[PDB]
Amino acid sequence: NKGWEAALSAIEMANLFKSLRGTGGSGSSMEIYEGKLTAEGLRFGIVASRFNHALVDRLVEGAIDSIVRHGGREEDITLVRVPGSWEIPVAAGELARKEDIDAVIAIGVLIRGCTPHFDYIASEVSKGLANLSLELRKPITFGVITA
Amino acid sequence: LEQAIERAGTKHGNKGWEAALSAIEMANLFKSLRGTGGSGSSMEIYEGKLTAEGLRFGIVASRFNHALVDRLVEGAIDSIVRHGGREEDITLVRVPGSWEIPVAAGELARKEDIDAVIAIGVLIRGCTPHFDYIASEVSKGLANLSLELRKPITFGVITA
Amino acid sequence: QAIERAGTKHGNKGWEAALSAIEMANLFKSLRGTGGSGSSMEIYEGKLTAEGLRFGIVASRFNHALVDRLVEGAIDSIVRHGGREEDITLVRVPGSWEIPVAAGELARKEDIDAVIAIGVLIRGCTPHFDYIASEVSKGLANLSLELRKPITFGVITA
Amino acid sequence: HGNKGWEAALSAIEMANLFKSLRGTGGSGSSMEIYEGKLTAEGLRFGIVASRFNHALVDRLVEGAIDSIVRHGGREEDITLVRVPGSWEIPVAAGELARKEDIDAVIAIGVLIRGCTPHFDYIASEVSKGLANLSLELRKPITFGVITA
Amino acid sequence: HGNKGWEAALSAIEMANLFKSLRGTGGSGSSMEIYEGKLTAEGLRFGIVASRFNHALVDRLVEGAIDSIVRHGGREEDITLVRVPGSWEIPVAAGELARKEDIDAVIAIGVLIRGCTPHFDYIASEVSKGLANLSLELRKPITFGVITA
Amino acid sequence: HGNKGWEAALSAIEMANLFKSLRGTGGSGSSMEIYEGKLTAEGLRFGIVASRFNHALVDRLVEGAIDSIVRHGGREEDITLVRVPGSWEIPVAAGELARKEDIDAVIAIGVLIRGCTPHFDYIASEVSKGLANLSLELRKPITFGVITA
Amino acid sequence: NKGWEAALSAIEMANLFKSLRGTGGSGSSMEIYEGKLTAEGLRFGIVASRFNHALVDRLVEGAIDSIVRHGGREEDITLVRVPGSWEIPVAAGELARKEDIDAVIAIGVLIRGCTPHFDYIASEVSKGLANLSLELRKPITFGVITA
């Protein structure tokens, strides 16, 4: 289930970035940054598509299940629904600008990966999410699949 | 007789119907997002309504294959008034070709009186494995406008 | 319960059955009014606006785990298209045998514009003729013609 | 407890309560009204129609019908029993009990036979078709519980 | 001409003129009376009900019906058209249209699934049963132009 | 009310009463003794094992398990809930609860998956085989209720 | 990677069984048992086969990676190698009888699953592991795959 794997990367990004904003050691050793797999006290946001109802729904349940079993709280989860895969970048950008949310998870399904014609739609979904992560300085997980 | 045959045709299944349908949901979704938050004690779920009343839309269409692109526009026109949108709140802009769709949609999206933008066009020689430059730029141009202006733009284009 | 809420409900038979009820409740309202200008062909088409409309839903409690998905899909489609949650009447019956008789009482009220029937059917070991499955379709069809009121019919076979 | 007579009986009590509240007083808004029948059988009258064919099986289903009613609060004075020679005659007998204003629900019990071919059985088709039409015309619940031998 | 919309349309005109002769006075006698319908659509008001399902096939049949009437002298103003989502609720829409005194004939167009793997269909039979039963009650001719896939 | 969780729960109460009377005082002749469990759940302790796979369905069955017990006279203080990641781990968890002398019955709830071929599913075969062997060795009832997706 | 999933079940069995050996609440509510996803202070044992070197090796690396990233310590991991899939039940039983080890993970690869002939070998691998879990009262994870 890609939903479990994509959600799991979101916990260890909030912890890693929280250590970055803090203060490291006073030298005397090789300073190292590391994120732990605890979702306590973290806020998440989930954006999922509507196309391919049979496939998308099971991926969403993994996202919530990953957070709650890893020590998270279901009260801090926000879910946004979009019509198609084209509307994920615009919806994720609006959701990520909120100060309360720490990470954004994107879920979707792609219908083809063996032709340049459909690569026009598929490329901009990944391209838009990548630009938002660098611009907003907030982690965004790319958890869509293809079939 | 010809006026009856063309008008009796149905525009429910064309891509113009789907493109206009997605714009209505996204327009209401952002209105709820920018509003006040929930009361807590439960997981928040956001979803847009399909009430098209009180919403303004813009449509950009190309001139290539005018016998085919016009019926796609009429499907988009039907969907807006289908769910309760007034016919006076829609704007129509025509462009000579698919290359200049992004630049035309930029002017409409910057207006404060427009809530969503729907783009309709047709491509040529889609049966080739070679990369197409004009087809890639029109798809890339609309994507960047939506992220910069924070306004949803719907992309519906078919290939011959 | 949020996991159940997170499950998508668009596109099922409950969504489709409730969609037709909204259109016909507005289509019949247009026929109740005066005629057109008489300048060309007079084509009618019901609207998808559900503002101020009233609906009734008949559901079978059999297969309680699966019937709720279709019931909630019909409820969602009413609200999602502008309808009010206060104008929905829901009744529940044990099996598909009692769906026609329950739908008749709701359809006879003057405060109801459309009636939606939701249920599931049993598939046997062989594709033989089913008396129970054939009778429920006939009962709802006869009620709509008699009562001058459109009743939608969405069921699936297990 | 698990025979079809018990299951057919249980639908009779809950329908009598459901139709009682449906035509009673109205709601008051502020929520969606939910109508569901109660399993209490107090103050209800019932009628039972049974066929004489396969007397060994039928007597078992009939005994379960009264047992289910009395267990859920019913009274043996209110129930009425009618016996018919065969399955073809159940619709005409059930109509007489349903037209009485002192009867709240009608329960039909019978045993069917396997036909020669998978084609439509005319006797089997008419008994189910006739009972359903009586319920719609008379606006009274009618329970249809049969077992094919 | 080669589609069922052509055939189902012309039956409406000749049946409509046939009913006009019967409503009038009798003949002069002295011979056998033969009542005949005419292929003249002048002065006739019709109604068309079509289903939105299978957009590719239905629209070709609808325009065929419009082509047939105008070719045989039909007038464009009198044509009335109603669209329905599916084939399940065709007769109920025709019921509201056939009971108008201004309407003389009703044409129904629809498309059903292939099926044929079971012994019966629970949808294709009901739409045909509803239209035939409705015509007898209203004493108004309603044609049947529904084609299976 | 009709889910498999309710049906699986009901067997737990009646077995605890049946095994209580079976090893209790003896009979006195003059007839054949008949032993049957009573549906009263008062004074009984239960243990529930549920799998995390398909959390949407499992939470519905689990809620029916407690609801059936408390309705028939049970008390929510006596019931014990244990959750396992999957169906393969149900036998080992059920054995720990059954070895406790404070537990009268053990209820197992899980959801299975369809295999690729009609051949034996090793995961599905061992979960049913393991639970049955625990009941015979420990002389304690164990209820096996699962649904294949 | 089935190695990540099979190893993950081992952490939540040691925590769950540790709560069983303790003492629950003094009533007043519905008593519930639950295991958490923390591998701190736990000991594990891994048994892996030798056949199909290209497939087995990547599954083993997931087993150690699952433990260390979830808060575990690599000093407590014990690994045993066996020639074929037939020798997993006998090796696991010897390893599980040690008092220090809390959980046992089995890794292997099966070559066929669509014939009764090879089902003789495959059934006894699963049958033997199931009996050891009930007899020794110690969790054993069934993490083999088929190809």
Residue numbers in the entry:
A (entry chain D), G (entry chain AC): 16 to 162
B (entry chain C): 3 to 162
C (entry chain EA): 5 to 162
D (entry chain IA), E (entry chain FA), F (entry chain BC): 14 to 162
Please share text taken word for word from the publication where this structure appeared:
As such, we found that a circularly permuted variant of a cage-forming enzyme, Aquifex aeolicus lumazine synthase, cpAaLS, assembles into a variety of hollow spherical and cylindrical structures in response to changes in ionic strength. Cryogenic electron microscopy revealed that these structures are composed entirely of pentameric subunits, and the dramatic cage-to-tube transformation is attributed to the moderately hindered 3-fold symmetry interaction and the imparted torsion angle of the building blocks, where both mechanisms are mediated by an α-helix domain that is untethered from the native position by circular permutation. While the wild-type protein, AaLS-wt, self-assembles into a ∼ 16 nm dodecahedral structure composed of 60 identical monomers,35 the negatively supercharged variants AaLS-neg and AaLS-13 adopt expanded 360- and 720-mer assemblies, respectively, constructed entirely from pentameric capsomers. Moreover, a circularly permuted variant of AaLS, cpAaLS(119), forms not only ∼24 nm and ∼28 nm expanded spherical cages, but also straight ∼24 nm-wide tubes of variable length. We previously designed two circularly permuted variants of AaLS and confirmed that their morphologies depend on the positions of the newly generated N- and C-termini. The native terminal amino acids were connected via an octapeptide linker using genetic fusion and new sequence termini were introduced either between residues 84 and 85 or 119 and 120, yielding cpAaLS(84) or cpAaLS(119), respectively.
The unique triple helix is not the only tubular structure formed by cpAaLS(119). In the cryo-EM micrographs, short and bent caterpillar-like objects, referred to as “twisted tubes” were also observed albeit at a very low frequency (left). However, introduction of C37S and A85C mutations into cpAaLS(119) to give cpAaLS(119, C37S, A85C) and a modified assembly protocol surreptitiously resulted in enrichment of the twisted tubular structure and allowed subsequent cryo-EM analysis (right). Since the twisted tubular assemblies were heterogeneous, we divided particle images into 3 classes and determined the structures individually. All three distinct twisted tube structures are composed of two compacted helical threads with 0-, 18-, and 28-Å gaps between them. This spring-like arrangement rationalizes the bending tendency. We also realized that one of the four pentamer interactions in the twisted tube has an acute bending angle (P0-P4 interaction). A possible disulfide bridge between two of the introduced cysteine residues at position 85 seems to support the unusual interaction mode, enhancing formation of the twisted tube.
